Design a protein around this ligand. Structure first.
Ligand SMILES: Cc1nn(-c2nc3c(F)cc(F)cc3s2)c(O)c1C(c1ccccc1C(=O)O)c1c(C)nn(-c2nc3c(F)cc(F)cc3s2)c1O
Ligand SMILES: [Zn+2]
Length: 344
């Protein structure tokens, strides 16, 4: 059924051609928002990080990160979670959001939301409150934009990342060092009621960079000889999960699975298969099959290390229970045995 996979990819490309216009609407609203926000003393250095689509099958649902540099940050890991932190300061335009020594995600979300509500009120845009994403904008008839606030730190990545991003045999030890000199991000995100002043690490910019500059060869996919199917494999994996989540929206079994699980699984497969010749475009069928198989193996063993924080198990039974993983395992295996009927 490799041809059927290409059929899917054809459809997905069409949907992207016919959304350029929507992305224009989004850029205009977002540019407006950023100008107003930059006049607030708290948000003076607000900017775009890189739009993106968390759901490949939802072309009108956009996703945008507003970054804000926080100099001289000091992090305090929450409860050995490796991914969630309290934000302190070494020595402040954010001082108004302090709860004691801690930058309050609650308060900084409050103001972020207030200001956005103001500007939307002045513009045919409508808003709705969602911590990350913080708000959802309705633009025109059927365009949504989730906006995440993200603190930026130009300091060294936290200790939990020391053994992560194991790209050395694939993208190289040089690239790994360059990427770890880039900043990292913190999004407001409560941890399990719930600890309500934690911030979670975010490496979405690094994920973006790897996906778009993904070969061992620097010229991978820039000529006929070197076309690979890495990006097509990830698209197919995302579309598979999205179709299944839609199909079983009435069950609780697939609610905790997201595109981040699929994308994490994929990067692990890139690590296991570092040579570009292992991703020949002519081998799309077996390449996707081997991505599907890897994700399934993560499901059955309940092991999916965060690609950047290897001690963080995305498939822990504290996060997703065994029954849910077994259901998804059964459904994917059915799809794969039947040439993926869910695609149509
Ligand atoms: C990737 C993703 N996909 N997805 C869906 N996919 C589907 C789908 F496929 C079908 C469907 F119907 C519905 C959805 S929604 C989603 O919501 C996300 C969220 C996200 C998207 C947009 C705004 C905010 C969030 C957010 O919550 O932060 C997301 C992001 C971008 N990063 N991230 C993590 N990064 C780290 C990390 F760096 C370290 C660590 F230890 C843990 C984590 S977790 C995470 O969880
Ligand atoms: Zn390539």
């Amino acid at each position: 059924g490799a041809s059927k996979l290409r059929a899917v990819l054809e459809k997905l490309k069409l949907s992207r051609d016919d959304i350029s216009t929507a992305a224009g609407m989004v850029k205009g609203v977002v540019d407006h928002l950023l100008l107003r926000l930059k006049c607030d003393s708290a948000f003076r250095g607000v900017g775009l990080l890189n739009y993106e689509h968390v759901k490949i099958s939802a072309p009108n649902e956009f996703d945008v990160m507003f970054k804000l540099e926080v100099p001289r940050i000091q992090l305090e890991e929450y409860s050995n979670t490796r991914a969630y932190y309290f934000v302190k300061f070494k020595r402040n335009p954010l001082s108004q959001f302090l709860e004691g020594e801690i930058l309050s995600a609650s308060k900084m979300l409050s103001k972020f939301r207030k200001i956005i509500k103001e500007e939307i009120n002045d513009i045919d845009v409508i808003m709705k409150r969602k911590g990350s994403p913080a708000v959802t904008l309705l633009i025109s008839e059927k365009i949504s934009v989730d906006i995440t606030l993200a603190l930026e730190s130009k300091s060294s990545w936290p200790a939990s990342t020391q053994e992560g991003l194991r790209i050395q045999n694939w993208l190289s030890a040089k690239v790994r060092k360059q990427l770890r000199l880039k900043p990292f991000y913190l999004v407001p995100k409560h941890a399990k009621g719930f600890q309500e002043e934690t911030w979670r690490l975010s490496f979405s910019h690094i994920e973006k960079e790897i996906l778009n500059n993904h070969g061992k060869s620097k010229t991978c996919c820039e000529n006929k000889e070197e076309k690979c199917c890495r990006k097509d494999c990830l698209k197919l994996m995302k579309y598979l999960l999205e179709q299944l989540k839609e199909r079983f929206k009435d069950k609780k079994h697939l609610d905790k699975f997201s595109s981040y699980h699929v994308k994490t699984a994929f990067f692990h497969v890139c690590t296991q298969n570092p040579q570009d010749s292992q991703w020949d475009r002519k081998d799309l069928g077996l390449c996707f099959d081997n991505c599907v198989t890897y994700f399934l193996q993560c499901l059955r063993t309940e092991k999916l290390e965060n690609y950047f924080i290897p001690e963080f198990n995305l498939f822990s039974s504290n996060l997703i229970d065994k029954r849910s993983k077994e259901f998804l395992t059964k459904q994917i295996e059915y799809e794969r045995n039947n040439e993926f009927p869910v695609f149509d």
